[PDB]
C-alpha cells in the first residue's frame, strides 16, 4: 500500500496517472502537505527537492528532475548547446540561435554575412514568457520588439505536406526513469498548420493558434493532429521513404544527445531520492528531410487519443518499477 501526493492540479498527464494509481487498489493518496509519501506528483515551480529523501523508511520518488530546466528553457537551451563540448557550437541539428537581453553584437555579426551573401536572412524572436513572437527579415525590428529573448534562424525551407502546402511540427514524448533509461514513446503527433505556407498563423503550428486564428482548423486531419500511421504512409506514397529512416533516426539521436549531456548534472543515481520526468520534444523537418530541434518541454500535455496509453506507461516503467504492484516505448540505449 504505497502513498502518493498530488501537488499539480492542472497536470492533465498526472491527473490520469493519479487516477490509474487509485484504480489499482494498492496506492493511497494523501494530503498535498503530508510528508509521509512514496511518490510526489510535484508542482512545476519551486518544487522543494531539498526536503525529499529525508523520511526514514520511505523510498521517495518525484516526477521531475531537479536541474532539467537547463534543457526546458529557451535561453538555457541555447547556452547549454553553445557551451557544452558534448554538443558544441558546431551542432548540426539545432538552428543558429542567440540570446538577447548577451549576444547582440554576435547576432548582428552573422546577420550581416547573410544580408551581404544574398542568402536567406529571416530570423525569429521568442521567449519563455509567451502564450508573443516576431518573425522578420530586418534585425532592427527583432531587437526593438524585445525592448530575456532568444533569436534563432527561421527555417525558411520547411517540409510541406500535400495536399495543402502546409507547415507542421513533430512532438515526441520521452520518459526518463530513475535509472536514467531513455524511453521514447512510440506514438508521436504532427501538429499541422491548416493554412498554406506563404513565404511572403500559417507559420506558427501551435494547437491553440490553429484553433483560434486559423479558418481551416480540422479540415485535413482531426484537430490539426496527424499521427504517425498517416504520416508514415504519406512519406511512402509521396517521398518513397519511411518515417523511421527519414526522420525518426535523427529524432532518437537528438533525444539521446540532449539527455546524455545533462546526465551528470541531474542524475539521481546515488541520491537520497529518485526522479523521473516526462519530456516533450518539438522537432522541425525541412524539405531535405533533415530534423531540427526547436525546444524541449518539461511539463508537456498529450494527445487525447494517447493519454490512455502513455499515462499507463508512465505507471509501468517509472512508478511500478520502484514500487511494484501485485512495450509502448523505444529504449534509447546508451
Amino acid at each position: 500500500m504505497y502513498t502518493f501526493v498530488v501537488r499539480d492540479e492542472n497536470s492533465s498527464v498526472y491527473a490520469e496517472v493519479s487516477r490509474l494509481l487509485l484504480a489499482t487498489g494498492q496506492w493511497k493518496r494523501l494530503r498535498k502537505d503530508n510528508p509521509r509519501f512514496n511518490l510526489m506528483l510535484g508542482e512545476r515551480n519551486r518544487l522543494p527537492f531539498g526536503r525529499l529523501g529525508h523520511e526514514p523508511g520511505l523510498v521517495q520518488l518525484v516526477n521531475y528532475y531537479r536541474g532539467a530546466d537547463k534543457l526546458c528553457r529557451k535561453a538555457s537551451l541555447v547556452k547549454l548547446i553553445k557551451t557544452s563540448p558534448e554538443l558544441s557550437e558546431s551542432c548540426t541539428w539545432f538552428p543558429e540561435s542567440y540570446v538577447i537581453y548577451d549576444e547582440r553584437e554576435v547576432f548582428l555579426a552573422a546577420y550581416n554575412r547573410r544580408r551581404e551573401g544574398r542568402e536567406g536572412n529571416v530570423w525569429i524572436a521568442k521567449s519563455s514568457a509567451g502564450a508573443g513572437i516576431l518573425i522578420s527579415s530586418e534585425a532592427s525590428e527583432l531587437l526593438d520588439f524585445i525592448d530575456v529573448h532568444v533569436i534563432q534562424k527561421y527555417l525558411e525551407k520547411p517540409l510541406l505536406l500535400e495536399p495543402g502546402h502546409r507547415k507542421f511540427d513533430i512532438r515526441s514524448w520521452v520518459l526518463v526513469d530513475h535509472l536514467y533509461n531513455i524511453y521514447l514513446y512510440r506514438e508521436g503527433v504532427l501538429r499541422t498548420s491548416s493554412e498554406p505556407y506563404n513565404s511572403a498563423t500559417c507559420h506558427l503550428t501551435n494547437h491553440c493558434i490553429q484553433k483560434e486564428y486559423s479558418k481551416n482548423y480540422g479540415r485535413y486531419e482531426e484537430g490539426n493532429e496527424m499521427f504517425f500511421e498517416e504520416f508514415n504512409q504519406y512519406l511512402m506514397d509521396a517521398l518513397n521513404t519511411t518515417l523511421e529512416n527519414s526522420i525518426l533516426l535523427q529524432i532518437k539521436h537528438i533525444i539521446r544527445s540532449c539527455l546524455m549531456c545533462i546526465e551528470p548534472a541531474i542524475s539521481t543515481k546515488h541520491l537520497h531520492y529518485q526522479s523521473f520526468q516526462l519530456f516533450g520534444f518539438d522537432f522541425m523537418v525541412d524539405e531535405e528531410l533533415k530534423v531540427w530541434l526547436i525546444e524541449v518541454n518539461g511539463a508537456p500535455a498529450c494527445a487525447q487519443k494517447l493519454y490512455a496509453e502513455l499515462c499507463q506507461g508512465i505507471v509501468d516503467v517509472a512508478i511500478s518499477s520502484v514500487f511494484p504492484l501485485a512495450s509502448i516505448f523505444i529504449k534509447l540505449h546508451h
Binding site: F49, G50, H54, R66, G67, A265, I266, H270, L271, H272
Partner: peptide, 14 residues
C-alpha cells in the same frame, strides 16, 4: 563528491 559520503545530505550540484 558523492552525496552518500557527506556529513549533511544535500546536492552540491545545485
Amino acid at each position: 563528491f558523492e552525496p552518500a559520503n557527506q556529513m549533511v545530505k544535500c546536492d552540491p550540484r545545485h
